Structure formats: C-alpha cells, structure tokens
Amino acid sequence: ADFTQGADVSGNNVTLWFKSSVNTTWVDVHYKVNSGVQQNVRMSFNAGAARFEHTILTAAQAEIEYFFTYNNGVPAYDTTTFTYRTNSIYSIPASSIPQPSEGGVSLKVMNGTGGAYTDDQIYWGVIGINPVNGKWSYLDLAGRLLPISSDLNNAPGHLTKDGINYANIYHKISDANWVNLPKIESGRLFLSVGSPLYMKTFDDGFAGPDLNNPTDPNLNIIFDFVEFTVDKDGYHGNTTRVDQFGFPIQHRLVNLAGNYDRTVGELESETRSGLFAKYVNEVPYEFKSLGTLQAPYRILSPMKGPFQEGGAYENYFAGYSSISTQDILLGVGEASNPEVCAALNRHVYTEPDNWNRVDQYYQAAPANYYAKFWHDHSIDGLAYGFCYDDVNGQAAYLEVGDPKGLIVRVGW
Structure with missing residues (x-):
C-alpha cells in the first residue's frame, strides 16, 4: 500500500503531502501542532503535483506530529506517525x-x-x-x-x-x-x-x-x-x-x-557569492572589472566591458594575432570561421595540432579567461563561454x- 509523504516549507507555512502509488481516492491527515487540539482534515488533491496536500499556515517554526488514513480500493489503512522537521x-x-x-x-x-x-x-x-x-x-x-x-x-x-x-x-x-x-x-x-x-x-x-x-x-x-x-x-x-x-x-x-x-x-556545489569571489581571483587583471562593473547583478562578457573598441583592452590579442580583439571575441570578420574563432579564444591558434586538444585550451595569454572560468566551474567542463564554444563539443x-x-x- 506504498506511498511517499513529506512536509514542504514555503515561507512560514508548511504543506503536508501524500502521494499514493496504489488505488487511492481519499486521504485524511491527522496532526498536532506543538501538542495542540488534534486536527483531522480530508486532504485536497493537487492534480499538477499528482498528490494530496494540506497547508498549515504559520507553522514553519512549530513541531508537527502527523499520520495519514487513506484507501487502497475500498479498505482504509493508517500510516505510522511522522514528525516535522x-x-x-x-x-x-x-x-x-x-x-x-x-x-x-x-x-x-x-x-x-x-x-x-x-x-x-x-x-x-x-x-x-x-x-x-x-x-x-x-x-x-x-x-x-x-x-x-x-x-x-x-x-x-x-x-x-x-x-x-x-x-x-x-x-x-x-x-x-x-x-x-x-x-x-x-x-x-x-x-x-x-x-x-x-x-x-x-x-x-x-x-x-x-x-x-x-x-x-x-x-x-x-x-x-x-x-x-x-x-x-x-x-x-x-x-x-x-x-x-x-x-x-x-x-x-x-x-x-x-x-x-x-x-x-x-x-x-558552486554558490553565486562564491562564483563572484572566485571570478575576480582567478582571472588576469584585464578581465577582473567584468566582475565588478555591474555587480552584484551580473558578471559581464568581455565585449560588454573594456575589451570593446576604444576600451582600455581593445588591443588585448594584438601580439598574438593580426585579427582584431573585437573580431575574435564576437566571431565575426576575420574570425567568422568558427574553428578560427575558437582556436584564437582558447590560445591554440598557432598550434593546429592542439585545436581539438582540450587539455591545451587557455594555457597562455592572451586568451578568453572569462570563457575559461565558466568551463572550470561547469558540469563536465561544458559551457557556452563565447559564441563558438561549441567547436569540439565544449558547449x-x-x-x-x-x-x-x-x-x-x-x-x-
């Protein structure tokens, strides 16, 4: 006659719920809040959660002892007693x-x-x-x-x-x-x-x-x-x-x-405050203000920051490529080819044998360290850190x- 049950907390309220895996059409809950008058309530069915629910207002700080009575076919059955928290x-x-x-x-x-x-x-x-x-x-x-x-x-x-x-x-x-x-x-x-x-x-x-x-x-x-x-x-x-x-x-x-x-x-396991803190620590000086300019609301991509034309780092890739920093960061112009764009962002452009070698990405500057950061803190190292990060299945x-x-x- 199995089921699952729980107490969901939302704000200061507690929603007791019962989800049946048998032939159940009605469920009563029997509960005491801090040992008060016993409440006996026929629970309502929430179709979108596919479970019976009863909400106890303002009981988030209370102790609640409860059990259920439910049917499986005609006969009814009592559960054992549960406790919140x-x-x-x-x-x-x-x-x-x-x-x-x-x-x-x-x-x-x-x-x-x-x-x-x-x-x-x-x-x-x-x-x-x-x-x-x-x-x-x-x-x-x-x-x-x-x-x-x-x-x-x-x-x-x-x-x-x-x-x-x-x-x-x-x-x-x-x-x-x-x-x-x-x-x-x-x-x-x-x-x-x-x-x-x-x-x-x-x-x-x-x-x-x-x-x-x-x-x-x-x-x-x-x-x-x-x-x-x-x-x-x-x-x-x-x-x-x-x-x-x-x-x-x-x-x-x-x-x-x-x-x-x-x-x-x-x-x-990464927290938002952790990410903002790690970002400004891990990235080279040129990329740090991306994490402060519009903090605490977001970290910016490089082209929304000082890498844009006229910005303090508008020539960030200058010594490495003859292709402009703006072309590289946005995947346009001389960097319109996705493979060229990606190689340049990952700093593997001048070594064709490393274009698809992930363990060689981002190993020297200049490179898209903003992009690197998201891979380092994402599930399976996968992230869309720049427009063409899908080259070699990295997105x-x-x-x-x-x-x-x-x-x-x-x-x-």
Missing part, C-alpha cells in the same frame, strides 16, 4: 515527469536558491516564434503560445516601471509544476529573481535587456536565460554565458525512451529526438 536537479525522478503533448516537452522551472528567494519571488517567461502561425508569441500556463504585439505592453495586467509600460509575459515558479512547451523557433526562457523583466514587445519581436545602456530598466535586475528550439527533430537547447552571467543554472533533459538523461550548467548544449521533460533550475 533534495532540491537538486537530479532528485526529480524521470518516472515522475508527465508525458508531453506531442511533439513538445514538459517544462519545469525549479527553485534551487536555498532560501535566497521563495517560489513566489522567482519569475520565468518563454518567448519565441510559433511555427503554427509564424507569430512571435509568449507561453501561457496552459502551454499555449499567445501572439505578442505592441499593444500587449498596455494591455490589462501589464507591468510598469518609471512610468513606462511593459508586456507581462511572466509567471512565478509557484504558479505551476509542469507546463507543456510546444514546438517553437528562436525560443528563449527568461528567468529573473525578485522581479520580472521589463521588455518591450512589438508586433514582430521584442527588445531584451541592453547592458550598454546606463538607463536600461533591467540593469538592476538579476536575470539569465536558456535558448531552445523544439521542432520535428526534437529538443535543442543550451545555457549561455555568451552575454553575461546572472546566477547559476542547471539544465536537465530526459527522453521518452528512458535512455537519455543529461544535465549541463554550473556545478550545484553547455543538449539535444534529443524524443524529448520528454526539461528541468531548468535557478541556483544560488
């Missing part, structure tokens, strides 16, 4: 992932901030092109792609900051367990803590955060994102530090056949033809 992305069992509605992916955004923010203080949104009507759209909680427009900025419910209206396309982690992500082109999942993002939508696209503008409304918001496409060949997606680093993210993809299960992103990039679930964890 992971969040790892690996702890979610693949068997617990809902089957997507074809040919999509079940998406879960997960709170791994360990107390920094509650589920109702982390926001997410998905914007991309719907191949069903070719329209730029955002995703709703029912898994529908709704067209964005200029008008959406002033529609009922819209956000405003500093007397300017912005489309409200965001959801809180507490708003959902799993959401179906349908087929989608040029997709981005935006994640932000404490606040949603403030972005203008147009009839044919949107304008994201502009990190070179001193007056950008998102400059003091902590955000990050994953990029994905869901199409007829399945899921294709990645985390990215190409533009900036906002907070640690893990990205886990599981397939329908049950033979693919992979995760990329920052190691779960935090995953794909599978028969996707089942995608879990994206906001760490801290």
Whole structure:
C-alpha cells in the first residue's frame, strides 16, 4: 500500500503531502501542532503535483506530529506517525515527469536558491516564434503560445516601471509544476529573481535587456536565460554565458525512451557569492572589472566591458594575432570561421595540432579567461563561454529526438 509523504516549507507555512502509488481516492491527515487540539482534515488533491496536500499556515517554526488514513480500493489503512522537521536537479525522478503533448516537452522551472528567494519571488517567461502561425508569441500556463504585439505592453495586467509600460509575459515558479512547451523557433526562457523583466514587445519581436545602456530598466535586475528550439527533430537547447552571467543554472533533459538523461550548467556545489569571489581571483587583471562593473547583478562578457573598441583592452590579442580583439571575441570578420574563432579564444591558434586538444585550451595569454572560468566551474567542463564554444563539443548544449521533460533550475 506504498506511498511517499513529506512536509514542504514555503515561507512560514508548511504543506503536508501524500502521494499514493496504489488505488487511492481519499486521504485524511491527522496532526498536532506543538501538542495542540488534534486536527483531522480530508486532504485536497493537487492534480499538477499528482498528490494530496494540506497547508498549515504559520507553522514553519512549530513541531508537527502527523499520520495519514487513506484507501487502497475500498479498505482504509493508517500510516505510522511522522514528525516535522533534495532540491537538486537530479532528485526529480524521470518516472515522475508527465508525458508531453506531442511533439513538445514538459517544462519545469525549479527553485534551487536555498532560501535566497521563495517560489513566489522567482519569475520565468518563454518567448519565441510559433511555427503554427509564424507569430512571435509568449507561453501561457496552459502551454499555449499567445501572439505578442505592441499593444500587449498596455494591455490589462501589464507591468510598469518609471512610468513606462511593459508586456507581462511572466509567471512565478509557484504558479505551476509542469507546463507543456510546444514546438517553437528562436525560443528563449527568461528567468529573473525578485522581479520580472521589463521588455518591450512589438508586433514582430521584442527588445531584451541592453547592458550598454546606463538607463536600461533591467540593469538592476538579476536575470539569465536558456535558448531552445523544439521542432520535428526534437529538443535543442543550451545555457549561455555568451552575454553575461546572472546566477547559476542547471539544465536537465530526459527522453521518452528512458535512455537519455543529461544535465549541463554550473556545478550545484558552486554558490553565486562564491562564483563572484572566485571570478575576480582567478582571472588576469584585464578581465577582473567584468566582475565588478555591474555587480552584484551580473558578471559581464568581455565585449560588454573594456575589451570593446576604444576600451582600455581593445588591443588585448594584438601580439598574438593580426585579427582584431573585437573580431575574435564576437566571431565575426576575420574570425567568422568558427574553428578560427575558437582556436584564437582558447590560445591554440598557432598550434593546429592542439585545436581539438582540450587539455591545451587557455594555457597562455592572451586568451578568453572569462570563457575559461565558466568551463572550470561547469558540469563536465561544458559551457557556452563565447559564441563558438561549441567547436569540439565544449558547449553547455543538449539535444534529443524524443524529448520528454526539461528541468531548468535557478541556483544560488
């Protein structure tokens, strides 16, 4: 008559839950808070968590003794008594992932901030092109792609900051367990803590955060994102530090056949404060201000900092290549070939025999030490630290033809 059970803490509240693996249609919980009047409650069924739940308000600091009565078929059974008192992305069992509605992916955004923010203080949104009507759209909680427009900025419910209206396309982690992500082109999942993002939508696209503008409304918001496409060949997606680093993210993809299960992103053992501290310590002087200029909100990529044209390090690669530092960092111009770009960033350009030898990457300056840092602190050494880090399979990039679930964890 097995089940699993637990007490989930959110803020100052405790939610007792019971998840049955048998023929259960009703469950009562019997509990005492600090030895008070016994409470006997028929629990409600939460379909999206597939479990029975009862919330005890303001009991996070109390001691709670409880047991359950549930049915398996007609007969009822009592559990033993439990007492109150992971969040790892690996702890979610693949068997617990809902089957997507074809040919999509079940998406879960997960709170791994360990107390920094509650589920109702982390926001997410998905914007991309719907191949069903070719329209730029955002995703709703029912898994529908709704067209964005200029008008959406002033529609009922819209956000405003500093007397300017912005489309409200965001959801809180507490708003959902799993959401179906349908087929989608040029997709981005935006994640932000404490606040949603403030972005203008147009009839044919949107304008994201502009990190070179001193007056950008998102400059003091902590955000990050994953990029994905869901199409007829399945899921294709990645985390990215190409533009900036906002907070640690893990990205886990599981397939329908049950033979693919992979995760990329920052190691779960790295903390955000640790990363900011290690960044400024590990990187050579030229790259340090990338970690301070817009702290504590992000670490910047080199071209958002003093490596840009005119900047104090605009000629950083000068003695090593005849190709400009700006071409190298952005993979354009004389560095438009991905292999040339990558070799130059990894400082293996002048030794062709080392272009695909990972243990020789970043071993001498100049090199993209910002990029190096993300590999050093990522799962399996995989990261998108610059635009062409996928050369020789180094990028935090995953794909599978028969996707089942995608879990994206906001760490801290």
